[PDB]
Amino acid sequence: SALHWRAAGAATVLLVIVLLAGSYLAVLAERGAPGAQLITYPRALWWSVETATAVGYGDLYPVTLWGRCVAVVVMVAGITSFGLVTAALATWFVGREQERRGH
Amino acid sequence: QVQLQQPGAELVKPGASVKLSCKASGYTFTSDWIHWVKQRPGHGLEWIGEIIPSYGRANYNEKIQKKATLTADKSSSTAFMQLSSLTSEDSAVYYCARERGDGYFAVWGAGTTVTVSSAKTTPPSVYPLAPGSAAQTNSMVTLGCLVKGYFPEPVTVTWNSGSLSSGVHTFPAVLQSDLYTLSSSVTVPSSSWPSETVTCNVAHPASSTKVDKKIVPRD
Amino acid sequence: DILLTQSPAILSVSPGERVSFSCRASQSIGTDIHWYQQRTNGSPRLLIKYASESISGIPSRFSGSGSGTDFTLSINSVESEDIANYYCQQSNRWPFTFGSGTKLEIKRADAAPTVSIFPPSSEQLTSGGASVVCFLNNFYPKDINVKWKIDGSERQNGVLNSWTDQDSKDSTYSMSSTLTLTKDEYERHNSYTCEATHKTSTSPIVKSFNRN
Ligand SMILES: CCCCCCCCCO
Ligand SMILES: [K+]
Ligand SMILES: [K+]
Ligand SMILES: [K+]
């Protein structure tokens, strides 16, 4: 099995895991902080997706240190996995172009 | 089945402490939160705090004087709230409730009536209330039973082991000389009594009592 | 924290009409509002979640509406069993908060009380006491006065009264009047009388008994 596609799938699974655990840990870290909105699991998961995609709707964000740390982990997981998919596509296209020219 | 089981009553001395329990049943999840809510008689609902049993983290209401400490035993699926150094301002019904993680209470317990007082616990004396010899009867006849001299609240009055629920009035207790007294009324087709039994069952949880008394005519 | 104002605190309606409870939040909270019902001596029961979503097992005449800061709980065709206190719990920001609650009353047709007087029981007499109990059952409205007479003379000492909240089965009220005496003082008299004066009639409803 090709390495780039394997790492791509691994980053997909790992990203899903980081999204779910990030929602759970976000709710756990944010409850107890007055004014916090990241306190229900469904919209904590929605916020996890927003964070991993950096879509920037700005409707939900953590206010505590540990919630912000969880947030950073989700950000870096999304940036890393999506950049990994980009790199895998690059490797694929370079292979197909290398065969297209008979080299 | 009832999802949250709470004891009926707890009698605390002023300055003492008490640990309330809340045993769970039904569907349990790692995402479950158990909340505790305070209701003084005649007043509204007051959020006390929450705990996530699968992790043990508990949060408390910041605005009130912290008297509670929340714990949870995961094997027995039980949540505990320890109230410490109780003032008469802490006498209230304390509910526990379950929350899947959406921020609303899907199920509540029946609540524990906490009375903080120096008075000793006293089981009730219940007497029958049957009509006098001269009373006339229409199509219906009303009987009752008198629950006198108990402390603390509450008592649960049923008629024929709960089988008779229509036409029942259990009055609020009245407190005097540090002892409570109420009466319960039941109305029944005048032909049905006394050929069909009529018995009132009075449970006093604070004294772990439950007594029956049948309503026999004065004949 | 987020304050939830439930005004008015008391709502009075006629049977079968549509009623609406109001719940205003101190800041915008989307639709993160839930509604609970608590009858007398009962536990709170969830009626509506997320401002408008139904709960299984709740009568379909319950509905909710609103978003932001203004929310409404509505009952189509109110009936006796709807008599309860209604709370609107918020969960948009930590910590969760409750509204102050709104009691629902039902104005029904006037009803005369059913009066019953009961002599002390034999067991209570062996105990050394004697309580004469009078029931004033299923009347409307709640305003009513009870009067005790011993041997034709009015008695006021040793009487304890208790009123029920509005009855969730027929929208009526009921009252108990208990006259507690010694066994000695009980057996020194003959006539015991309970007198109920209600809007339903100009003449009082009188129930008496003699130990003869
Ligand atoms: C990995 C993030 C930790 C989960 C939240 C812990 C919060 C404890 C202090 O409030
Ligand atoms: K962006
Ligand atoms: K943005
Ligand atoms: K980018």
* Residue ranges per structural domain of chain B: 1-118, 119-217
> Is residue A88 in contact with ligand 1, taking CB distance under 6 Å?
no
Chain A residues with at least one Cβ partner in B under 8 Å: 24, 27-28, 31-32, 34, 39-42
Pocket test for ligand 1, best of A23, A66, A73 (most atoms within 8 A of CB): A66
The Cα–Cα gap between C47 and C55 comes to 6
| Nearest residue to B176 via CA among C160, C162, C185 | C160
* Boundaries of every domain in chain A: 1-103
Chain A residue numbers with beta carbons less than 8 Å from the beta carbon of B49 are none
Half-sphere exposure of B217 (CA within 13 A, CB side): 13
Distance from A2 to chain C by nearest Cα, in Å? 47
Burial of B97 (0-12, 13-18, 19+ CB in 10 A): buried
What distance in angstroms lies between residue A53's CA and the mean position of ligand 3's atoms?
Answer: 12
Ranges assigned E (strand) in chain B = 4-5, 9-12, 18-24, 33-39, 46-52, 57-60, 68-73, 78-83, 92-99, 107-108, 112-116, 125-129, 140-150, 156-159, 168-170, 174-176, 179-189, 199-204, 209-214
CB atoms within 10 A of CB A95: 12
Alpha carbon of A57 to ligand 3 centroid (Å): 5
The structure tokens listed for C28 are 């915008």
The experimental method, as deposited, was X-ray
**What resolution in angstroms, rounded to 1 decimal?**
2.3
Q: Indicate whether residue A66 lines ligand 1 (CB < 6 A).
A: yes
A39/B52 touch (CB, cutoff 8 Å), yes or no: no
Which two three-digit tokens encode residue A46? Answer: 């929605």
Provide the residue type at A52 as one letter: A
| Residues C72-77: contacts with CB under 8 Å, at least 24 apart | C72/C20, C72/C21, C72/C22, C72/C23, C73/C20, C73/C21, C73/C23, C73/C35, C73/C47, C73/C48, C74/C18, C74/C19, C74/C20, C74/C21, C75/C18, C75/C19, C75/C20, C75/C104, C76/C18, C77/C16, C77/C17, C77/C18
Strand, helix or coil at C16?
Answer: coil
Tokens of C145: 């006065």
Q: How many whole angstroms separate alpha carbon B1 and alpha carbon A92?
A: 59
Q: Cα separation of C114 and C101, whole Å?
A: 32
Comparing C-alpha atoms, which of C80, C182, C192 is closest to residue C133?
A: C192
CB of A25 closer than 6 angstroms to any ligand 1 atom: yes
| Helix or strand (DSSP H, E) at C147 | strand C144-150
Under 8 Å between Cβ of C34 and B45: no
Which among A32, A34, A40 has the least Cβ separation from residue B101? Answer: A40
Structural domains for chain C: 1-108 (2.60.40.10), 109-211 (2.60.40.10)
Task: Report yes or no: B41 at the A interface, CB cutoff 8 Å.
Answer: no
Q: How far is the CA of A76 from the centre of ligand 2 (A)?
A: 13
Nearest Cα of chain B lies from the Cα of A23 at a distance, in angstroms, of 11
Q: What is the distance of C-alpha C60 from the center of its chain?
A: 24
Contact (Cβ atoms closer than 8 angstroms) between residue B108 and residue B2: no
Whether chain A has a CB inside 8 Å of the CB on B219: the answer is no
B 120-159 near A (Cβ less than 8 A): none
Among all chains, which residue has been given the structure tokens 């009855």?
C167
Q: What is the C-alpha separation between B184 and C75, in angstroms, rounded?
A: 32
SS3 C115: strand
* Cα–Cα distance measured from residue C176 to residue B146, given in angstroms and rounded to the nearest whole number: 11
Do C119 and C211 meet the contact criterion of CB atoms below 8 Å apart?
A: yes
C135 near C142, Cβ under 8 Å? no
Instruction: Report the SS3 class of residue C99.
Output: coil
Residues B145 and B138: their CA atoms lie apart, in Å, by: 21
Q: Which amino acid is at B65?
A: Q
Instruction: Name residues whose C-beta falls within 8 Å of residue C97's C-beta, 6 or more positions apart in sequence.
Output: B47, C1, C2, C3, C4, C89, C90
> B13: which residues sit within 8 A by CB, 6+ positions away?
B116, B117, B118
Contact: C94, A32; criterion CB under 8 Å: yes
Are residues A36 and C91, on separate chains, in Cβ contact within 8 Å? Answer: no
* Ligand 1 site, residue A15, Cβ cutoff 6 A: no
A36 ligand 1 Cβ < 6 A: no
Indicate the residue type of A32: G
Measure CA of the first residue to CA of the last residue in chain A; give whole Å: 22
> Three-state SS for A38?
coil
List Cβ neighbours of A26 (8 Å cut-off, separation of 6 or more).
A38, A44, A47, A48, A62, A67, A70, A71
Asked if the bond preceding C95 is cis, omega within 30° of 0, the reply is yes
CB-closest option in B52, B62, B102 to A34: B62
Strands B78-83 and B18-24, by their bridges, are: antiparallel
Any idea which fold B119-217 has?
Answer: Immunoglobulin-like (2.60.40)
Residues 6+ apart with CB under 8 A from C79: C15, C16, C106
Q: How many CA atoms does the CB half-sphere of C123 hold within 13 Å?
A: 14
Alpha-carbon gap: A50 to the closest alpha carbon of chain B (Å): 19
- Under CATH, to which class is A1-103 assigned? mainly alpha
